[PDB]
């Protein structure tokens, strides 16, 4: 809205970054990471002259992805869970 | 929030200490500064009782209310998102409806007190921002709990005694029956509380231990609780609304008495009045004890209509259980059908501003009468005039500024976040605009100090008008009023024509800018199809004819006024929905008066039944195309043809773009939609020829100095430059940018000679070159914005397929850029021109698609950089950095070229670098790339030029 070309700026490198896309119900999207730079359209228009490099430009095997599986699976309660806490009280006497 | 109770009590006590009785001025200042500084940082929800106290006491408008209302407006301006936005203020929660109704009551109490009280500079000046802040903060779509609430007015709890008031027996039967019924329901609550209603007093149960059945219960000990219920019902019937049974006649009761359900809206409003009675009548004794104690207003003894929902429930529940007992028995309280829109904040304050609008019409009529009849300074409505001028005009300005999205919010396409304004709200806000226009029609002479305020406020009311829904399916009086106001404005423009050969001052400063803004709004929202028609279209016809006649006439005053006519007429062309420039195919257009009106209607309106007979003054669009083309060929300057550039160019640059969408080339939405042939036969070809004429006249007028309207000409050509033909670049921009480049090169050569000399003549020559390329800066700030949009459209085309002419244009703009970068005088004179002519704003809008720091030259260069960056191979990119270090050594272009020729063998290697593999493969995959570009001369040329561009870019970014 202010006219700045950069959407997000002053972003700390931190641990790293990964391409990601969250599709909704009945939604279809083609995620082209850039294994085939020829298949990367509009890259010459934006990115080629700016110095940007295709993601996985020289990677031989395709980049594996991780979909958010919706299957409800039991996992242990985190020790630092913000709301629920599990206490390991000792048996002592007259108590298990 | 953990222990906010004592924070609230601290706020209350600090406010009392500030409103103490024996304090010094400095001490009072310290207390008040603490209060504002504290409430600025605390959460707005912590003001639930301090805000209530302010609602109660600030409408007194005493000398002690200065800091109260100042802190009030500071807090509300801080948390305008907390109330107006339905989502709240981010992490902070959403406002309560109780707080919203406190805001409403506070706003209107301050307004009415400011109304009756006499004008005083301090209160009005320091309270108008407060009133605007409360009005803006409270959302317009909010509806109060009840429009017909109590609205009553240390507090005085009005004792409405009813023991003396007699009760008709036909209803007194169920008054006594409900007294017994509430005793039984009290016992039912006790037994429901796991404590069965005892018959003997015993501490084993915390509840009432002596609620015996009615047979064994003593009458007096019933009355201990029964008489309060009887007096409750007796007070409720003693008020003018008397509770009347529907059916004639009349230790647990069979029907459950629950206050959760609700009766009719009126019944709920005066049950709220009954709870206000529980406060006043039943706590006059409490107020006597409280005045004996000297503890200030007790929390319940605060007026009930302004009390917080959490603690007013103590009497709300009692009033509601009484009214619900009446409701399940069918009893109705006979004593108003207020619509939801009237109930709403928006339309209520709208009716009130209409009331003050007729009051101010009377006031200004009397003021004009006493101005005309001698000099009568004494005015019976002087307080009203001062109130209007100092409060009402800024208030409507600010309120319409912060809620213009709401008043413009179409129900079909919701624009306002809070909601959409009602149709009645839209129509009478349009009528308010028309009434303000009629008021200031000849009042512009008086209210001289407030005249700019009037014109800006009426600009705001001109913006955000649903002319669509008021003229179509809207009130006949209001639509006739606006149509007659446009007709009178057209007659006024004709009078203005006669004058060029108050009213003249009106047309000079108030009529024309507001008319332009109205046309601009109608053009943006494309409302003209159902708005600019019939008599409105006729009035616009005579307006355009008369201002064309004004353009024809040539005098000094009309020359100085021509920018206003050009802007106004461009906006009316953009809001004018019939192609009057296509008279032969006017039957195809369904918006014209001839097809909308019947033949009899045309006869009684005096219509010529043809566009040609309507306006033969303006020739056809082909004729003005030929005229502007001939003027371009002849090189018509502003001296030779000022009216053309001022007024007739807006015709083309406004009507032609918008009607290109109606032209044949633009694809129709459907075959039946396109079955009527387009009334305008315009395509992109005539648009492109119009750009050619504009470019030709600009380059011919480039040498002309003191040309100012050329900037607004560039602004007017900002939309036309889009959808430009590819050949237009080498047709027009390459020659004129070449001329600009060579003239700038001559100027910079003179500047270099000036720099090498150091005499007293060198200082005069320094001022001379400053003034010599100030015009160059103006010309570049004209031409380059046209290039910015042009490269924006064709950058994809040039990058997908390289154009040699595009590369040469890149070299041209890069040469201009290095000329601007090397010379310090260039940058300071550019900044001086920007600050002189306020170019920062228009540069900001030019950079915006669809600033002082921002350098147009740099921006243009960065946008065009990829075009002239793709011309070189990646192995040449592997030579750019050494050429940059050559330029870092401050060496000459000849030497950097020679030692680049020495480093011809120092280029990078594709098998050397893995990234060069894919970069070099893509550089081959470019369709316009062959192997002939690998010639060493071409390679060194492009390397040197690209490196010069990059080095001057990085020096501009980081000196």
DSSP per position, B747-809: HHHHHHHHHH--SHHHHHHHHHHHHHHHHHHHHHHHHHHHHHHHHHHHHHHHHHS--HHHHHH
Reference B357, options B447, B440, B295, B296; nearest CA is B440
Residue pair A34/B894 in contact (Cβ under 8 Å)? The answer is no
Orientation of helix B893-902 relative to helix B936-957, angle to 10°: 130
Could you give the residue ranges of the DSSP H alpha helices within B506-555? 512-525, 528-531, 534-552
Tell me the chain B residues in contact with residue A42 when contact means C-beta distances shorter than 8 Å: 796
A73 touches chain B (CB under 8 A): no
Distance CA B144, CA B149 (A): 9
Separation between Cα atoms, residue B732 and residue B752, nearest integer Å: 30
Among candidates B796, B869, B915 on the partner chain, residue whose Cβ is nearest the Cβ of A49 = B869
What is the phi/psi pair of residue B547, to 5°? -75, -25
Contact A37/B at CB under 8 A: yes
Question: Among B299, B440, B302, which Cα is nearest to B368's?
Answer: B440
Which residues partner with B242 through β-bridges? B334
3-state secondary structure (DSSP) of residue B411 = coil
Q: Which residues contact B377 (CB under 8 A, 6 or more apart)?
A: none
As a three-state string, the secondary structure of B632-669 is HHHCCCCCCCHHHHHHHHHHHHHHHHHHHCCCCCCCCC
Contact B796 A45 (CB under 8 A): yes
Alpha-carbon Rg for chain B, nearest whole angstrom, is: 39
Burial of B430 (0-12, 13-18, 19+ CB in 10 A): buried
Contacts for B89 with CB less than 8 Å, ≥ 6 apart? B44, B79, B81, B82
For B240, list phi and psi in degrees, rounded to 5. Answer: -60, -25
Q: How far apart are CA B461 and CA A80, in angstroms?
A: 57
Beta partners for B244?
B332
DSSP at B86: T
Tokens (6 digits) for B406: 């709401």
B563 near B646, Cβ under 8 Å? yes
Nearest to B922 among A37, A42, A50 (CB): A37
Taking the CA of residue A24 and the nearest CA in chain B, the distance in Å comes to 24
Residues of B within 8 A of A54 (CB-CB) are 918
Q: Do A48 and B870 touch (CB under 8 A)?
A: yes
Contact B870/A44, CB-based, under 8 Å? yes
Kindly determine whether residue A58 and residue B918, on different chains, have CB atoms separated by under 8 Å: yes
Contact A45 B799 (CB under 8 A): yes
Q: Do A3 and B925 touch (CB under 8 A)?
A: no
B852 near B865, Cβ under 8 Å? no
Q: Are B571 and B516 within 8 A, CB to CB?
A: yes
- B330-333 CB contacts, 8 Å cutoff, 24+ apart: B330/B245, B330/B246, B330/B247, B331/B174, B331/B243, B331/B244, B331/B245, B331/B246, B332/B243, B332/B244, B332/B246, B332/B267, B333/B236, B333/B241, B333/B242, B333/B243, B333/B244, B333/B266, B333/B267, B333/B270
A92 touches chain B (CB under 8 A): no
Residues forming beta bridges with residue B92, ordered by sequence position? B89
Query: Which helix or strand (DSSP H or E) is residue B242 part of?
Result: strand B242-244
End-to-end CA gap in chain A: 63
Task: Tell me how far apart the alpha carbons of residues B654 and B651 are, in angstroms, rounded to a whole number.
Answer: 6
| Cα B942 from chain centre | 50
b/e burial code for range B60-82 (CB count within 10 A of at least 16 → b): ebeeebebbbbbbbbbbebbbeb
Asked whether the beta carbons of residue B847 and residue A3 sit closer than 8 angstroms, the reply is yes
β-partners of residue B332 are B244
Stretch (H or E) spanning B244 = strand B242-244
By C-alpha distance, the chain A residue nearest B866 is: A49
Cα separation values, B659 from B582, B662, B678, B718, Å: 11, 5, 10, 16
CA dist B279 and B52 (Å) reads 16
Residue B298's Cβ-count burial label (10 Å; 0-12, 13-18, 19+) is middle
Least Cα distance to B107 among B65, B54, B160 occurs for B54
* Pair of tokens at residue B729: 């670049």
Q: Which two tokens stand for residue B175?
A: 């008054």
How far is it, in rounded angstroms, from Cα B41 to Cα B47?
11
CB B478 within 8 A of CB B414: no
What part of A 48-67 touches B (C-beta under 8 Å)?
48-50, 53-54, 57-58
Which chain B residues have any C-beta within 8 angstroms of a chain A C-beta?
795-796, 799-800, 844, 847-848, 865-866, 869-870, 914-915, 917-918, 921-922, 925-926
Give CA–CA dist B350/B41, Å, rounded. 34
For chain B, the residue count is 959
Contact between chains at A44 and B926 (C-beta distance less than 8 A): yes
Dump the DSSP string for B309-355.
Answer: TTTTHHHHHHHHHHHHHHHHTT-EEE-----HHHHBHHHHHHHHHHH
Whole-angstrom Cα distance, residue B635 to residue B699?
Answer: 9
Contact A49 B847 (CB under 8 A): no
In Å, the largest CA–CA distance within chain A is 77
**What technique was this entry resolved by?**
cryo-EM
Given resolution (angstroms):
3.6
Other C-beta atoms closer than 10 Å to the C-beta of B719 total 16
User: Is residue A44 within 8 angstroms of chain B, CB to CB?
Assistant: yes
Element (H, E) at B243: strand B242-244
Record: contact A44-B922, CB cut-off 8 A: yes
Indicate the residue of A45, A49, A53 with minimum beta-carbon distance to B915: A53
Residue among B848, B866, B926 whose CB faces A3 most closely: B848
Residues of B in contact with A49 (CB under 8 A): 799, 865-866, 869-870
A10-19: long-range contacts, CB 8 A cutoff, minimum separation 24: A19/A55
- Angle at CA B476, nearest 5°, toward B472 and B478? 90
Contact B848/A53, CB-based, under 8 Å? no
Contact A44 B800 (CB under 8 A): yes
Report the distance separating Cα B659 and Cα B400, nearest Å.
32
Is there a contact between B800 and A37 if contact means CB atoms under 8 Å apart? Answer: no
Residue from B858, B864, B860 nearest B827 by CA: B858
> Among candidates B772, B627, B645, which has minimal Cα distance to B709?
B645
To the nearest whole angstrom, how far is the Cα of B863 from the nearest Cα of chain A?
A: 11
């Amino acid at each position: 809205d202010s006219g700045s070309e950069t959407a997000f700026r002053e972003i700390e490198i931190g641990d790293g970054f990964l391409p990601v896309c969250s599709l909704g119900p009945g939604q279809v999207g083609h995620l082209n990471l850039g294994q085939d730079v020829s298949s990367l359209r509009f890259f010459a228009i934006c990115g080629l002259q700016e110095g940007f490099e295709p993601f996985a430009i020289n990677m031989q095997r395709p980049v594996t992805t991780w979909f958010s599986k919706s299957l409800p699976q039991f996992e242990p309660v985190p020790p630092e869970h913000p709301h629920y806490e599990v206490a390991r009280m000792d048996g002592t006497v007259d108590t298990p | 929030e953990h222990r906010a109770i004592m924070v609230d009590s601290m706020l209350h006590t600090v406010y009392r200490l500030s409103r103490g009785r024996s304090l010094t001025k400095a001490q009072r200042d310290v207390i008040e500064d603490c209060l504002m500084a504290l409430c600025r940082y605390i959460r707005p929800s912590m003001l639930q009782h301090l805000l209530r106290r302010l609602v109660f006491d600030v409408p007194i408008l005493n000398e002690f209310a200065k800091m109260p209302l100042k802190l009030l407006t500071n807090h509300y301006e801080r948390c305008w998102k907390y109330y107006c936005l339905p989502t709240g203020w981010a992490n902070f929660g959403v406002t309560s409806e109780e707080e919203l109704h406190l805001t409403r009551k506070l706003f209107w109490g301050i307004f009415d007190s400011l109304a009756h009280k006499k004008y005083d500079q301090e209160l009005y000046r320091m309270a108008m921002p407060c009133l605007c802040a409360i009005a803006g903060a409270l959302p317009p779509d909010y509806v109060d709990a009840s429009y017909s609430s109590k609205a009553e007015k240390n507090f005085d709890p009005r004792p409405v005694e009813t023991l003396n008031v007699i009760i008709p027996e036909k209803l007194d039967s169920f008054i006594n029956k409900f007294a017994e019924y509430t005793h039984e329901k009290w016992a039912f609550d006790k037994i429901q509380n796991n404590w069965s209603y005892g018959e003997n007093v015993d501490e084993e149960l915390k509840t009432h231990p002596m609620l015996r059945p009615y047979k064994t219960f003593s009458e007096k000990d019933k009355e201990i609780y029964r008489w309060p219920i009887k007096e409750s019902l007796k007070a409720m019937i003693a008020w003018e609304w008397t509770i009347e049974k529907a059916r004639e006649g009349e230790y647990n009761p069979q029907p459950p008495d629950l206050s959760g359900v609700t009766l009719s809206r009126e019944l709920q409003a005066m049950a709220e009045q009954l709870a206000e009675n529980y406060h006043n009548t039943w706590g006059r004794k409490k107020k006597q004890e409280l005045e004996a104690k000297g503890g200030g207003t007790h929390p319940l003894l605060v007026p009930y209509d302004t009390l917080t929902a959490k603690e007013k429930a103590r009497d709300r529940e009692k009033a509601q259980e009484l009214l619900k007992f009446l409701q399940m028995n069918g009893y109705a309280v006979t004593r108003l059908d207020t619509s939801s829109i009237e109930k709403r904040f928006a339309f209520g304050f709208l009716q009130q501003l209409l009331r003050w609008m007729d009051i101010s019409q009377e006031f200004i009529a009397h003021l004009e009468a006493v101005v005309s009849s001698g000099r009568v300074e004494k005015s019976p409505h002087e307080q009203e005039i001062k109130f209007f001028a100092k409060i009402l005009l800024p208030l409507i300005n600010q309120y319409f500024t912060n809620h213009c999205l709401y008043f413009l919010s179409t129900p079909a396409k919701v624009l306002g976040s809070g909601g959409h304004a009602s149709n009645k709200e839209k129509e009478m806000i349009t009528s308010l605009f028309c009434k303000l226009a009629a008021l200031v029609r000849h009042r512009v002479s008086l209210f001289g100090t407030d005249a700019p305020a009037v014109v800006n406020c009426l600009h705001i009311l001109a913006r955000s008008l649903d002319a669509r829904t008021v003229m179509k399916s809207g009130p006949e009086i209001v639509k006739a009023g606006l149509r007659s106001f446009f007709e009178s404005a057209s007659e006024d423009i004709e009078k203005m024509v006669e004058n060029l050969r108050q009213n003249l001052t009106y047309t000079t400063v108030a009529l024309l800018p507001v008319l332009t803004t109205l046309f601009q709004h109608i053009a943006q929202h494309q409302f003209g199809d159902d708005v600019i028609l019939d008599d409105v279209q006729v009035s616009c016809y005579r307006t355009l004819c008369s201002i064309y006649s004004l353009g024809t006439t040539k005098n000094t005053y009309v020359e100085k006024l021509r920018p206003a006519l050009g802007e106004c007429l461009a906006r009316l062309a953009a809001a004018m929905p019939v192609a009057f420039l296509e008279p032969q195919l006017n039957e195809y257009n369904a918006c014209s008066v001839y097809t909308t009106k019947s033949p009899r209607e045309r006869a009684i309106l005096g219509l010529p039944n043809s566009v040609e007979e309507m306006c033969p003054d303006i020739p056809v669009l082909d004729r003005l195309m030929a005229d502007i083309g001939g003027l371009a060929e002849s090189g018509a300057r502003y001296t030779e043809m000022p009216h053309v550039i001022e007024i007739t160019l807006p015709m083309l640059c406004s009507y032609l773009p918008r009607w290109w969408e109606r032209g044949p080339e633009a694809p129709p939405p459907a075959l039946p939609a396109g079955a009527p042939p387009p009334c305008t036969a315009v395509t992109s070809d005539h648009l492109n020829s119009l750009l050619g004429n504009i470019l030709r006249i600009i380059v011919n007028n480039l040498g002309i100095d003191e040309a100012t309207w050329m900037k607004r000409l560039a602004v007017f050509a900002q939309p036309i430059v889009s959808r430009a033909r590819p050949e237009l670049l080498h047709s027009h921009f390459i020659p004129t940018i070449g001329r600009l480049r060579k003239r700038a090169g001559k100027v910079v050569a003179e500047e270099e000679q000036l720099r090498l000399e150091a005499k007293a003549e060198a200082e005069e020559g320094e001022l001379l070159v400053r003034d010599e390329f100030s015009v160059l800066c103006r010309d570049l700030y004209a031409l380059y914005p046209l290039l910015i949009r042009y490269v924006d459209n064709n950058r994809a085309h040039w990058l997908t397929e390289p154009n040699a002419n595009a590369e040469e244009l890149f070299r041209m703009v890069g040469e201009i850029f290095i000329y601007w970068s090397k010379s310090h005088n260039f940058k300071r004179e550019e900044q001086n021109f920007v600050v002189q002519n306020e170019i920062n704003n228009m540069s900001f809008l030019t950079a915006d698609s669809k600033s002082v720091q921002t350098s147009l030259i740099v921006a243009t260069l960065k946008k065009m950089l990829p075009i002239g960056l793709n011309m070189c191979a990646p192995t040449d990119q592997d030579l750019i950095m050494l050429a940059k270090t050559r330029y870092a050594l401050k060496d000459t272009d000849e030497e950097v070229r020679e030692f680049l020729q020495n480093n011809l063998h120092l280029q990078g290697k594709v098998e050397g670098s893995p990234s060069l593999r894919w970069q070099m493969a893509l550089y081959r995959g470019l369709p316009g790339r062959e192997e002939d570009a690998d010639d060493p001369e071409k390679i060194v040329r492009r390397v040197q030029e690209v490196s010069a561009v990059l080095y001057h870019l990085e020096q501009t970014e980081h000196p």
